[PDB]
Design an enzyme around this catalytic site. Structure first.
Site, short mmCIF file in Angstrom:
data_model
loop_
_atom_site.label_atom_id
_atom_site.label_comp_id
_atom_site.label_asym_id
_atom_site.label_seq_id
_atom_site.Cartn_x
_atom_site.Cartn_y
_atom_site.Cartn_z
CG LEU A 16 -2.16 -0.80 1.21
CD1 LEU A 16 -2.88 -0.68 2.49
CD2 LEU A 16 -3.04 -0.41 0.03
CE1 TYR A 21 0.09 5.05 5.45
CE2 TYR A 21 -0.15 4.10 3.27
CZ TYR A 21 -0.43 5.11 4.21
OH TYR A 21 -1.26 6.15 3.91
CG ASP A 127 3.25 9.12 16.02
OD1 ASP A 127 3.30 10.38 15.85
OD2 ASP A 127 3.82 8.38 15.22
NE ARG A 131 3.68 11.45 11.87
CZ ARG A 131 3.68 12.58 12.54
NH1 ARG A 131 3.52 13.73 11.93
NH2 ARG A 131 3.83 12.55 13.86
CG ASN A 132 0.08 7.71 12.79
OD1 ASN A 132 0.31 6.73 12.13
ND2 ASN A 132 0.99 8.24 13.65
C1 NIL Z 1 1.32 -1.55 21.00
C2 NIL Z 1 0.36 -0.59 20.35
C3 NIL Z 1 -0.27 -0.72 19.16
N1 NIL Z 1 -1.04 0.43 18.95
C4 NIL Z 1 -1.92 0.71 17.90
C5 NIL Z 1 -1.84 0.06 16.67
C6 NIL Z 1 -2.71 0.38 15.60
N2 NIL Z 1 -2.61 -0.26 14.37
C7 NIL Z 1 -3.00 0.23 13.19
O1 NIL Z 1 -3.64 1.23 12.99
C8 NIL Z 1 -2.88 -0.69 12.03
C9 NIL Z 1 -2.38 -2.00 12.10
C10 NIL Z 1 -2.42 -2.84 10.98
C11 NIL Z 1 -3.01 -2.44 9.80
C12 NIL Z 1 -3.05 -3.38 8.60
C13 NIL Z 1 -3.59 -1.18 9.76
N3 NIL Z 1 -4.06 -0.69 8.53
C14 NIL Z 1 -3.21 0.10 7.74
N4 NIL Z 1 -1.94 0.42 7.95
C15 NIL Z 1 -1.37 1.24 7.05
C16 NIL Z 1 -2.05 1.76 6.01
C17 NIL Z 1 -3.34 1.41 5.85
C18 NIL Z 1 -4.18 1.87 4.71
C19 NIL Z 1 -3.66 2.71 3.71
C20 NIL Z 1 -4.49 3.14 2.69
C21 NIL Z 1 -5.81 2.68 2.67
N5 NIL Z 1 -6.34 1.89 3.62
C22 NIL Z 1 -5.53 1.48 4.61
N6 NIL Z 1 -3.94 0.57 6.70
C23 NIL Z 1 -3.53 -0.34 10.88
C24 NIL Z 1 -3.76 1.30 15.84
C25 NIL Z 1 -3.83 1.98 17.09
C26 NIL Z 1 -4.92 2.98 17.30
F1 NIL Z 1 -4.67 4.14 16.66
F2 NIL Z 1 -6.13 2.62 16.84
F3 NIL Z 1 -5.16 3.16 18.60
C27 NIL Z 1 -2.93 1.65 18.11
C28 NIL Z 1 -0.82 1.17 20.04
N7 NIL Z 1 0.03 0.62 20.86
#
Ligand code: NIL
Length: 264
Positions: A16, A21, A127, A131-132
């Site tokens: 992606l 990412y 964070d 960007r997030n």
């Molecule tokens: C130890 C720890 C973990 N976190 C934490 C992790 C995430 N993970 C992701 O958002 C994440 C993980 C895996 C995936 C596959 C995704 N999805 C992802 N990642 C990058 C790009 C995209 C994307 C890009 C373009 C279109 N659609 C999706 N999706 C998100 C989310 C959070 C939050 F913000 F929600 F609280 C917290 C905090 N502390």
């Protein structure tokens, strides 16, 4: 574990975001021909921590965990795929006539709702930034955490205290003392609001990173962006109070955005 899923149930496609990412791929969950995003392990305890934390958080405005493959390598975390990608690029690339002031306010309101939920959970994001965040249909916005600090090019993240920090989004006590809390998330939310109001300009324009802390300590703050409503700037200013306890809670921030959005 209801979250475990069949690695075979997923057809993996391209990386992606053309690689911005890291190891995250477009996938199709064949069972439902559903486009998903899949993060793979290319750091095992950190990856499994991420999965475990995501199982305990669930909100309309937080990225949706759909499953994991962690029973054998390569491990996967699978989330929903958000049509319009990350909020930073979205803002930079949008039609501003469509994504106008009322829409900006609506985005901010949605972000504040996720943050309010995380605050209720005593969960510290660490964070928060455009960007997030991710954008879907109808200006749906969700908070996420792409673990950007090791991948991202540029001086967004820079060496500090043994890791890489986004200095310009970071609260002063987090910079000086490595103290992160819900109130440092509030500080970063204020920076996010400025990102939104400027359609994704880089903060403290032209000011070198090495001078930011000392400026903040002397009550320098970014000026109101062109066309940012007064009340919104007032909320930024409150988020950037030096003393964390002087900053509003996300419950207060959400209520204020809800009221402003109702009146628009
Ligand atoms: C130890 C720890 C973990 N976190 C934490 C992790 C995430 N993970 C992701 O958002 C994440 C993980 C895996 C995936 C596959 C995704 N999805 C992802 N990642 C990058 C790009 C995209 C994307 C890009 C373009 C279109 N659609 C999706 N999706 C998100 C989310 C959070 C939050 F913000 F929600 F609280 C917290 C905090 N502390």
């Amino acid at each position: 574990d209801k979250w475990e899923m069949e690695r075979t149930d997923i057809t993996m496609k391209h990386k992606l975001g053309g690689g911005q990412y890291g190891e995250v791929y477009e996938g199709v969950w064949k069972k439902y021909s559903l486009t998903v995003a899949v993060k793979t392990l290319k750091e095992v305890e950190e990856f499994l921590k991420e999965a475990a934390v995501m199982k305990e958080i669930k909100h309309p405005n937080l990225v949706q965990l759909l499953g994991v493959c962690t029973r054998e390598p390569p491990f996967y975390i699978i989330t929903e795929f958000m049509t319009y990608g990350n909020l930073l690029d979205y803002l930079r690339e949008c039609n501003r006539q469509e994504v106008n002031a009322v829409v900006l306010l609506y985005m901010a309101t949605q972000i504040s709702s996720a943050m309010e939920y995380l605050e209720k959970k005593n969960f510290i994001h660490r964070d928060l930034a455009a960007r997030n965040c991710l954008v879907g249909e109808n200006h749906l916005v969700k908070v996420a955490d792409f673990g950007l600090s090791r991948l991202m090019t540029g001086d967004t993240y820079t060496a500090h205290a043994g890791a890489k920090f986004p200095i310009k989004w970071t609260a002063p006590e987090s910079l000086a003392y490595n103290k992160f809390s819900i109130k440092s998330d509030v500080w970063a939310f204020g920076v996010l609001l400025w990102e939104i109001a400027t359609y994704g300009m880089s903060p403290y324009p032209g000011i070198d990173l090495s001078q930011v802390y000392e400026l903040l300590e002397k009550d320098y703050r970014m000026e109101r962006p062109e066309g940012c409503p007064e009340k919104v700037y007032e909320l930024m200013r409150a988020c950037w109070q030096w003393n964390p306890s002087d900053r509003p809670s996300f419950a207060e921030i959400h209520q204020a955005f809800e009221t402003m959005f109702q009146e628009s």
